[PDB]
Amino acid sequence: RERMCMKIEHDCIFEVKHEGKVTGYACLVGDKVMKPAHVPGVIDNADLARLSYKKSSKYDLECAQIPVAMKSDASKYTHEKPEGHYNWHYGAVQYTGGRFTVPTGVGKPGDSGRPIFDNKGPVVAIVLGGANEGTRTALSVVTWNKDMVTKITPEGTVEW
């Protein structure tokens, strides 16, 4: 379950810096580069911080377009999502009923920006923060239609 995943984040993860102290993460998906605008900071690369950004606080997301040099270094993606096992940086996640789950407390504050996958390779979606549960946690993810983006935010959460 880890033998397919591990190569990917080495290709596709930058993170953010503010005052020489990492806090968030950043991804590069498809054609547009991604940042969850909740955390303050600057990306840890020389040039592409010089870029245009389009912000709406209604979703708390942020994109820009990748310049043509490292454009061929992003993952694959789709919208087809039957229920079943899926995977991430700290194990395997289950999903059904419009509800994502993983057991208790294996995520921390200071950890936004973690993409989540399938088995057969494309990237799926992207996490925000957590919510108390008793046993198996609630998530906070933004995702896609065939055509549109959408937030879902269940009750009783904390914004990481």
Add this chain to the structure above:
Amino acid sequence: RERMCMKIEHDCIFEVKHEGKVTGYACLVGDKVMKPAHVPGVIDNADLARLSYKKSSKYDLECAQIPVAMKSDASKYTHEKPEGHYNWHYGAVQYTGGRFTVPTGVGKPGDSGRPIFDNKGPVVAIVLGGANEGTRTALSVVTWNKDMVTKITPEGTVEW
């Protein structure tokens, strides 16, 4: 004699930089962070150079207070000091009569900031520069009472 010492400086030593060129060293002791203000430069870390500093040229020392993140990474310390063997980064040092000794020339200019220990673990004191001797060298150390700090500076020395 080295089997207890070696882990400590890896936990407790930063050094100074000025123009991409190390010259001094820096320690983190108890509750207050330490720098011998003789050498110009900036510490080689992102954030804690943004700190308050209190300077008196009467002693040529400099302290600040450690922010609460890496506060639990400093050594132990005391003031009880009978005469006997003690140890440091280049061997074993002897002390009596208010006089510290080590044999010839095993220290250089560009080497201020070296803490010195006991056997049983706490840190003791901190060095400044050297003095010619013939055979076994004279030191230049600042140290502690039960309550106060104190310099001692024997005749015929050179400020490293």
Add this chain to the structure above:
Amino acid sequence: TIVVVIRVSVVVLLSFAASVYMCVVARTKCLTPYALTPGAVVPVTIGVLCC
């Protein structure tokens, strides 16, 4: 009338400014080695606005 009143005003205030100027640096030197130790055992010498 002016020529007296301005000179007496300026000889008084700098001495006011002098008096405060050296009293603090005594409070500095009387305090400052106590700032330095890893240990906050300041004695009961509070007439000097202890931290």
